[PDB]
Amino acid sequence: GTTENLYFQGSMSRITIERDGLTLVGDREEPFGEIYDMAILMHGFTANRNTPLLRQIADNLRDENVASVRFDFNGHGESDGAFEDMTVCNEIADAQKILEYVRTDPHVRNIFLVGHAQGGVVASMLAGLYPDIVKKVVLLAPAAQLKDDALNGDTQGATYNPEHIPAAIPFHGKKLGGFYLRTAQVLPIYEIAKHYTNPVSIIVGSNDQVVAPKYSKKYDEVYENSELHMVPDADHSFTGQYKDSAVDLTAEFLKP
Amino acid sequence: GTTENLYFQGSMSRITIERDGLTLVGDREEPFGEIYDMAILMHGFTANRNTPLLRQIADNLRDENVASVRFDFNGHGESDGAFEDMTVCNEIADAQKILEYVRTDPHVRNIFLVGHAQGGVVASMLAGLYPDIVKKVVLLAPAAQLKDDALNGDTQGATYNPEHIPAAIPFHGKKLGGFYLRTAQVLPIYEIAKHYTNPVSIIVGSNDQVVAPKYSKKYDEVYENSELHMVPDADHSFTGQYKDSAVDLTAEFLKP
Ligand SMILES: CCOC(=O)/C=C/c1ccc(O)c(OC)c1
Ligand SMILES: CCOC(=O)/C=C/c1ccc(O)c(OC)c1
């Protein structure tokens, strides 16, 4: 009475890519098979490509025969660049080189974007710039609030005059670029995101203490083909018990 | 009978600066003195920092005791980076590192921007992001048309589907990045430039056949404190006779 139950199948690769003289470091996960859809997974502000959330997303996508790549943004994790030089704009430039890496790959069928938080802002504006290429987008707690906070001169507790932004501000151990804050103020987030008319899923925790729920709702009102999933009680980063519910909504939207 | 006519006084330095792991190469010109105003001079699309126009502007500013720096943008002249990776966005990032270099210099009093054509677009966007820092701006045939052309699918004769832009398009023997064109299409040129309320002088040739002078008129309408100088018969580049008129209006506006 022997049983055998397959739970893991495929390949995992450490990838490096160049953007303007910076090395970006990523992990590629593929299922077995010559052709597969491929998701680009994008982390949040001060996070990295190997959060529990993004690992579990790559794992459950692979179970559904969907490949994934997840890169450290410039100034984060193992990728090059000073944290203080990172902006939402140069993270969009990182994501574009990753999209070109994937679009050029002979194994790939359709390209999906998955962005958590600031990674969700990046994903939404990349999709707006490549709506001909991106087939599905998942936004998790997309952090469009970073624009309103930069305009109000209050970024998660760090205060500054929004009309005389310093060169850099102290931020929880780190140095946040004046340029991050000046570009955040004028980011055409919703203006660019609305060019993407293909399917979008927006996943938000009811208990998100970092980004107000209003931001996710505005994405839902601006997208032609959106669904909005409010996960009861979930936190900002979908941690512990809330990880599984974000992963299940992601995998179920992207699966063949 | 003795005559003495001074025709050159100051210091010229070759500068290099880093932006995201790219070296940018520039020429710095100063007059004699411990404290001076400093103009950042910004070249156009496929040009470099040593066009006749920009050398003569640096020369005439130094005679009026105004220092200047002129850098090759990424993908141009002697600077790092492939032409095909250049966007308007990453030239604004180049210009921000130049602004930081100049703003950090103990000799520099007030900072002026001077931008020709695409350089004018860059200068206008940087001034909008740093309206608290930039004291004067001169735009010479600012090429805000690059947005409308990208949306039309016709960039100086290079044609493409504006909703399915290729990875790169052949462009006068070089390769122009798809990302240049997709970001050109959504650039909030006038919306960002508007935030600059200090003095601006806009210098346009009535016979510009590369950028419609209407784009310079639009800047004049958008700015709080602008003057418009339409140079009868002058071409896009301000070649020959037209160079002295462009130089003279620049030096007159910035002089102490
Ligand atoms: C992308 C990971 O981002 C988050 O987890 C939260 C984002 C966030 C929210 C408000 C802000 O003012 C902000 O400015 C830097 C960022
Ligand atoms: C900045 C130097 O730029 C020029 O001399 C002219 C620029 C120009 C005009 C129309 C365009 O569609 C364009 O697309 C790249 C560029």
Author numbering:
A (entry chain A), B (entry chain B): -10 to 245
What's the publication's text?
Feruloyl esterases (FAEs, E.C. 3.1.1.73), a subfamily of carboxylic acid esterases, are mainly associated with the release and exploitation of HCAs from plant cell walls. In this study, we aimed to obtain and characterize a feruloyl esterase (LaFae) from Lactobacillus acidophilus. To further investigate the active site configuration of LaFae, crystal structures of unliganded and ethyl ferulate-bound LaFae were determined at 2.3 and 2.19 Å resolutions, respectively. Seven α-helices surround the β-sheets and form a core domain that contains an active site with conserved catalytic triad residues (Ser106, Asp197 and His225).
We also resolved the crystal structure of ethyl ferulate-bound LaFae mutant (S106A) at 2.19 Å resolution and analyzed its substrate binding mode. Ethyl ferulate complexed LaFae crystallized in the C121 space group with four molecules in an asymmetric unit. In a close-up view of the substrate binding site of the complex structure, the electron density map (contoured at 1.0 σ) of ethyl ferulate was observed near the S106A mutation position. Notably, the carbonyl group of ethyl ferulate was discovered to interact directly with the NE2 atom of His225 at a 2.5 Å distance and the 4′-hydroxyl group of ethyl ferulate also formed hydrogen bonds with Asp138 at a 2.4 Å distance. The substrate-binding pocket of LaFae comprised of hydrophobic residues F34 and V200 and polar residues Q107, Q134, D138, T144, Q145, Y169, D197 and H225. A structural superposition of the ligand-free form and ethyl ferulate-bound LaFae yielded a root-mean-square deviation value of 0.261 Å over 209 residues, indicating a highly similar overall structure. In the substrate-bound conformation, two anti-parallel β strands formed a sheet within the cap domain (α5–α6 loop region of the apo structure). Additionally, the comparative b-factor analysis showed that the binding of ethyl ferulate caused a reduced structural flexibility on the α5–α6 loop region. It is thought that this loop region plays a role in the open/close movement of LaFae when the substrate is bound. Furthermore, the conformational change of the cap domain region in substrate-free, as well as the ethyl ferulate bound structure, presented open and closed movements of LaFae when harboring ethyl ferulate as a substrate.
